[PDB]
Amino acid sequence: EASRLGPVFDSCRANNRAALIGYLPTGYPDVPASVAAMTALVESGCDIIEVGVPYSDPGMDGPTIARATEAALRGGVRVRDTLAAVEAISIAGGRAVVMTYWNPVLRYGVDAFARDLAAAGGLGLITPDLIPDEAQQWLAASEEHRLDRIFLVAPSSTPERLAATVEASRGFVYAASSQAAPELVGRVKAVSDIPVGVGLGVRSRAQAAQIAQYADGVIVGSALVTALTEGLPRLRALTGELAAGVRLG
Amino acid sequence: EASRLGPVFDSCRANNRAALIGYLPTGYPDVPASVAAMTALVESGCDIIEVGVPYSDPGMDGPTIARATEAALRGGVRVRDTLAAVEAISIAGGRAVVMTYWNPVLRYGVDAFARDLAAAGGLGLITPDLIPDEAQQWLAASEEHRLDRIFLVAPSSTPERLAATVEASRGFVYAASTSQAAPELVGRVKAVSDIPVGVGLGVRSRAQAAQIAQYADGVIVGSALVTALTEGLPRLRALTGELAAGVRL
Amino acid sequence: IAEPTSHDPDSGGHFGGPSGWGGRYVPEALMAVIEEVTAAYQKERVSQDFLDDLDRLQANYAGRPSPLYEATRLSQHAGSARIFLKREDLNHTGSHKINNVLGQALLARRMGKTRVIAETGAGQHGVATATACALLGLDCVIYMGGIDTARQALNVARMRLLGAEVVAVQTGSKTLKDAINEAFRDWVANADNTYYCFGTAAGPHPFPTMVRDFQRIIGMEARVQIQGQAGRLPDAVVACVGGGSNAIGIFHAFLDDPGVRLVGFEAAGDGVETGRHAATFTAGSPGAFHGSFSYLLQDEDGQTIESHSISAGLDYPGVGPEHAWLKEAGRVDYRPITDSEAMDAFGLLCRMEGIIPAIESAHAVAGALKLGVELGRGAVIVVNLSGRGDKDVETAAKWFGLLGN
Amino acid sequence: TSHDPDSGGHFGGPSGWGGRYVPEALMAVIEEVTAAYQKERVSQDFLDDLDRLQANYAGRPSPLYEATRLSQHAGSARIFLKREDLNHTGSHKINNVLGQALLARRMGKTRVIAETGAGQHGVATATACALLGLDCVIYMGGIDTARQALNVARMRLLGAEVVAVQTGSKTLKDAINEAFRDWVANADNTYYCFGTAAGPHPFPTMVRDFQRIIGMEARVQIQGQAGRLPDAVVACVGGGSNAIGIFHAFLDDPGVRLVGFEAAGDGVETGRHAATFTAGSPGAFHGSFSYLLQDEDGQTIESHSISAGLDYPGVGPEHAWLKEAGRVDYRPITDSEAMDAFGLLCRMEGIIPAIESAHAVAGALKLGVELGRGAVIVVNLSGRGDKDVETAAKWFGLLG
Numbered sequence A: 001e002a003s004r005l006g007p008v009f010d011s012c013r014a015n016n017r018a019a020l021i022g023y024l025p026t027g028y029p030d031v032p033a034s035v036a037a038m039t040a041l042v043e044s045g046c047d048i049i050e051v052g053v054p055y056s057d058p059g060m061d062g063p064t065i066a067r068a069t070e071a072a073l074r075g076g077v078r079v080r081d082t083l084a085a086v087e088a089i090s091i092a093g094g095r096a097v098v099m100t101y102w103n104p105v106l107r108y109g110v111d112a113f114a115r116d117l118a119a120a121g122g123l124g125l126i127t128p129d130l131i132p133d134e135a136q137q138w139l140a141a142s143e144e145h146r147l148d149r150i151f152l153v154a155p156s157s158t159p160e161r162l163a164a165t166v167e168a169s170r171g172f173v174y175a176a177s178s179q180a181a182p183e184l185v186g187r188v189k190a191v192s193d194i195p196v197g198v199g200l201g202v203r204s205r206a207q208a209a210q211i212a213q214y215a216d217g218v219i220v221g222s223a224l225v226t227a228l229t230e231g232l233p234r235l236r237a238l239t240g241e242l243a244a245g246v247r248l249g
Numbered sequence B: 001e002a003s004r005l006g007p008v009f010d011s012c013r014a015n016n017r018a019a020l021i022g023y024l025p026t027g028y029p030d031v032p033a034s035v036a037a038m039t040a041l042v043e044s045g046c047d048i049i050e051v052g053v054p055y056s057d058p059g060m061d062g063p064t065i066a067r068a069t070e071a072a073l074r075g076g077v078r079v080r081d082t083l084a085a086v087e088a089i090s091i092a093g094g095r096a097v098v099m100t101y102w103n104p105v106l107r108y109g110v111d112a113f114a115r116d117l118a119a120a121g122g123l124g125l126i127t128p129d130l131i132p133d134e135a136q137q138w139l140a141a142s143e144e145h146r147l148d149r150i151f152l153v154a155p156s157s158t159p160e161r162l163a164a165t166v167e168a169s170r171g172f173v174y175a176a177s178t179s180q181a182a183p184e185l186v187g188r189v190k191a192v193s194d195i196p197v198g199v200g201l202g203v204r205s206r207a208q209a210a211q212i213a214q215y216a217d218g219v220i221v222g223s224a225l226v227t228a229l230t231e232g233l234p235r236l237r238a239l240t241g242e243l244a245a246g247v248r249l
Numbered sequence C: 001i002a003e004p005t006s007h008d009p010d011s012g013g014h015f016g017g018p019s020g021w022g023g024r025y026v027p028e029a030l031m032a033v034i035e036e037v038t039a040a041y042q043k044e045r046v047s048q049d050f051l052d053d054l055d056r057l058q059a060n061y062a063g064r065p066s067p068l069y070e071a072t073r074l075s076q077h078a079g080s081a082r083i084f085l086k087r088e089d090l091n092h093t094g095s096h097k098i099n100n101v102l103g104q105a106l107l108a109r110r111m112g113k114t115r116v117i118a119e120t121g122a123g124q125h126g127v128a129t130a131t132a133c134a135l136l137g138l139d140c141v142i143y144m145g146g147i148d149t150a151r152q153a154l155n156v157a158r159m160r161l162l163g164a165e166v167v168a169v170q171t172g173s174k175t176l177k178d179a180i181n182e183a184f185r186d187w188v189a190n191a192d193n194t195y196y197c198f199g200t201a202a203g204p205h206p207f208p209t210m211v212r213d214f215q216r217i218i219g220m221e222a223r224v225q226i227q228g229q230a231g232r233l234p235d236a237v238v239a240c241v242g243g244g245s246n247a248i249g250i251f252h253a254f255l256d257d258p259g260v261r262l263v264g265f266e267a268a269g270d271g272v273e274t275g276r277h278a279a280t281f282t283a284g285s286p287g288a289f290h291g292s293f294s295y296l297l298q299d300e301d302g303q304t305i306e307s308h309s310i311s312a313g314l315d316y317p318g319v320g321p322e323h324a325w326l327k328e329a330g331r332v333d334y335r336p337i338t339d340s341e342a343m344d345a346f347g348l349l350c351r352m353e354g355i356i357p358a359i360e361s362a363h364a365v366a367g368a369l370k371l372g373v374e375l376g377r378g379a380v381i382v383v384n385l386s387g388r389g390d391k392d393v394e395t396a397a398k399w400f401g402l403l404g405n
Numbered sequence D: 001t002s003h004d005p006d007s008g009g010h011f012g013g014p015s016g017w018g019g020r021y022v023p024e025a026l027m028a029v030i031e032e033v034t035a036a037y038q039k040e041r042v043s044q045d046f047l048d049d050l051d052r053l054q055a056n057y058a059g060r061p062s063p064l065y066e067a068t069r070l071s072q073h074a075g076s077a078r079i080f081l082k083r084e085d086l087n088h089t090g091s092h093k094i095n096n097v098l099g100q101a102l103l104a105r106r107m108g109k110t111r112v113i114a115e116t117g118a119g120q121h122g123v124a125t126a127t128a129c130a131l132l133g134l135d136c137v138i139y140m141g142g143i144d145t146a147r148q149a150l151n152v153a154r155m156r157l158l159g160a161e162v163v164a165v166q167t168g169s170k171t172l173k174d175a176i177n178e179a180f181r182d183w184v185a186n187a188d189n190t191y192y193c194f195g196t197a198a199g200p201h202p203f204p205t206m207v208r209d210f211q212r213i214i215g216m217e218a219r220v221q222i223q224g225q226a227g228r229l230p231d232a233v234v235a236c237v238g239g240g241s242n243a244i245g246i247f248h249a250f251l252d253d254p255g256v257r258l259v260g261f262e263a264a265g266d267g268v269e270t271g272r273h274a275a276t277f278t279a280g281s282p283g284a285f286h287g288s289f290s291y292l293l294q295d296e297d298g299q300t301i302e303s304h305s306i307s308a309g310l311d312y313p314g315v316g317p318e319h320a321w322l323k324e325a326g327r328v329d330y331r332p333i334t335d336s337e338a339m340d341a342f343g344l345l346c347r348m349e350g351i352i353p354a355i356e357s358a359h360a361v362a363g364a365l366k367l368g369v370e371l372g373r374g375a376v377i378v379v380n381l382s383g384r385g386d387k388d389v390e391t392a393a394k395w396f397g398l399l400g
């Protein structure tokens, strides 16, 4: 049986391009506006949406997204708002996964959250502070509810841990990061054919193009939050520039 | 054989009165003014003058005398100024003993201070922070230069220490208590010796002098004379007049 | 030499089952350096030369052993029970935290790390880390919240006099738990040459075990001392619980002593019902936080609730996983102590014994008095006096109106 | 009893160091304290009470730490730090106040008074009084209370009263003058817990005896750790209590150099110092014949030092005797030298020293340069420098 995000990358590889993967946090600047912006991402060329659950202590988030999630939590954003954002993206014909720190999921209930996310049209889950070593409940709920599980690898990942993390993944494996990123993608592709997305502080078409040379997916987060802060039209402009970048010909 | 102040207390018993012993510090408010005031004490009826050597840390002095000797030292008073005052009191027919803490005497030289004090007409030395236990050098100089040694006793003095202190004294014994303690102290001294006894109780009135002349061979007045001199020299002359009246009652 | 490992977690760092407390809730980007530390500690904790080095510094540099003092003038206020104070307040730098930084700083040298980072709340652990780094010639960078830096001018000066660098964390709530997040980001970027000297018995494996081991010396000494001074094992061993390092350090030697009650006292702030507190076990619930699965103060969505206490060291919304396991297993009871109970104890210890305790430790003293009343006349209670209260004089003076306006 | 004074408190016979330069009004309570001390001095109950307190309450023994990272700055000598900074309350003064406070309760006294400068001895005395249930009154100079609010709060927290002294120049010597007057009036129920190895007999001897434990431990510890007696034992000298404490056990060791380092302020050539032996002269002050800073008439002159504990115009009489005997040398250390050692000990060993103690460290650095590689120097690290962090932060410009 195939992963939920499988056919998306197949279609992209057929059209000689990478999948454009866009991140936006729920509730920034408020819940309606963020849903409007996530909908605009679907309308502007985003193949996959990363719906971020704002967390009070986001260790892996850079300053741009940290300030956005702080603002979203001040506005009273809830975990259920992320489920509603996913329903909106499904209705708009998009494809949404959820990026979340693990404690909100534990609080919600791991099986309950997988069930409700799947019902909401969600396709998978990106877990930046959940390593395979702690993912027993998640792997069972991932299979029970047919959700993709996107773990992260890093440049410093040991050969043993990298293979284990790739073997535990489904959909794509998130390669987070001079030449470190392509070398990391090379190591993943040396052991598996799973799609690899690359996050690299992308903020221009040219950068998106470089990553599409070796990666199956280009992940853009900080730059979209910055563009959204300026306004919805700027976000549409930027996303179109990025959709052009992932396309090689 | 006899003490230097012996004749003075003899003349006082023969006239049915105690001795009026007046204290002033050298150099308050300045050296010439203090000598003018000490001369005024001789004129206004003082039997014995206590020329005080201002000391930088007078542990046994109250606030009225300590602030005056602070002012005198601030004015630049020197120890030699005390010997000039003793000379002026002597030439005016007065009878002067010096009261001083012991370190200025050590700094001067005990035998040299006794010599120059004797040469100025001084009759004795009152030593509030020198006990007989440390008075070897002083006892020798006191005999060599024929000066009275006025040690102090206290209400808390032990029987052995009071007898030893009275025995080492010459001229008179300063009984210091600064209601029934002062007469009892004089009683304890007269039970072991016939040496005259001076008493200092912060006398400030004519009646207080008479109360003490009823049992003490001498009435010592210090703080009140300093306060009077601060007001002015005529106030000093007046108060010293009233004190000379109290001792004959 | 080295003590057995009967109470240790599994190879994944879990207490009481492979899906129990502790573990490693960290990003994969950190797992390389975490495995490097775990292997380094696993090697050195059985190296006689390493334990000899640490013992040497504990004796001649830190001043161990710390004495056990029977506060005979506290008895009347503790139901006539007998209060024995384990005097970690006498350690060099003034708290038990020196035991931790001496171990981890030795470890960072053994690993070839040249740079040490650490978090600090009001400055206690930053000064302790900067102290060990000065002693061992390691470069030190302390992360401290911008609210705490502006409020702790002299502690920043201490750390600088010790040669360390202080960074102001102006993100998040700009306090202890955001300093920890900033240090975590530093380590992710600089794992090659940087060691993270963590300040309590929390975090991902192997830090709860490692920190507990560097603090076990407290309970090992106290268990010998209380038997020599009282003639028997105590009826109870109590301590205050922020992250848990000083409590677990004195608890551990007594775990298999069946008759010895173990009680940890946590900061109740204005009261557990006011929502201005840090009573993690009393009002928190299980969850993943700062690298481990344990108890923390969190709302219905899993977001961290900000904690409040008149003490800085207890002002932390989480707690170490080994305490969660001991709570679940019923070995240790965890009870709340308010700001007022602690300040009351703080003052009573000043007037009765002449010991100015840390306000953190005053919570433990306060609870010890209450326990003495429950246990009654003659009960032997050992109290961990985790630190001295020189750092807290200004706070206590204001509390008791000794500064005026 | 080998280096002890005579029944009158005099060291060195004819030179007459020490003694009792006090008024007769105080001699009854001074003879009472002397008699009480010679009784408890040899009482096993008293010694066992004190040893118990020193061990379980104060934290004795203090360790001896070889500060190897200082060696390169001390001519490759080996500097050992006798860590009195680790004592309860953070200095050697706890040694003195425990002995005297136990004595005061043995004597039946119910009130203890003590002087203090910046607050060190005041906090120590209040500490011992809180412990033993004695009522405590601290006399502090008005200039000192005004800038030491937290130490005053420490004493108040401990249950003591603090009296600001506005007489005289409002400093330490004036607090001593005021505590003297209190004792004269209240000798019935009051014990004067003096803060250094000065004053009238029996205080220089008694205080030294309560501090002797430093030297005795240090002499055992240095033979254990280094295998031989040290080449030199150094300490800072204010009134003399921590120096005489660590010196005494070494007095009859003829190869052991003893060097006390005193505060030279801005320089001895500047008239802003506290270098009693370097620039003072013999005189009677605060109940003893010893050295003090005085003018031509014998008036006390103001002392200056960036250190508060060394800012005292006098010095204990047993030191004056040991200087006359040639057994101990007394050398000056300036503000700059002390502060440079302060920072060096922070950066090299992670130990924040009392600025008083940094004078001794600074002197050890100079002495190691002249004694050469491998020389063993024991330094009494009399106190910790928490109280001095603000002074030192300004000095190195770390504030604002």
Ligand SMILES: Cc1cc(F)c(-c2ccc([C@H]3[C@H](C#N)N[C@H]3CF)cc2)c(F)c1
Pocket: A057, A058, A059, A060, A101, A128, A129, C025, C026, C027, C030, C180, C181, C184, C196, C198, C202, C203, C204, C207, C289, C290, C291
């Ligand atoms: C010794 C030690 C090591 C650690 F890595 C951490 C730690 C772990 C995770 C986080 C991040 C996490 C993510 N991503 N979410 C934030 C808060 F939990 C922060 C700090 C620690 F607290 C102590």
Ligand SMILES: Cc1cc(F)c(-c2ccc([C@H]3[C@H](C#N)N[C@H]3CF)cc2)c(F)c1
Pocket: B057, B058, B059, B060, B101, B128, B129, D021, D022, D023, D026, D176, D177, D180, D192, D194, D198, D199, D200, D203, D285, D286, D287
């Ligand atoms: C334990 C102890 C006991 C003492 F009596 C003194 C003392 C003695 C004398 C003075 C007086 C002296 C006189 N009168 N002139 C003042 C300055 F010296 C002050 C204090 C002391 F300093 C410590």
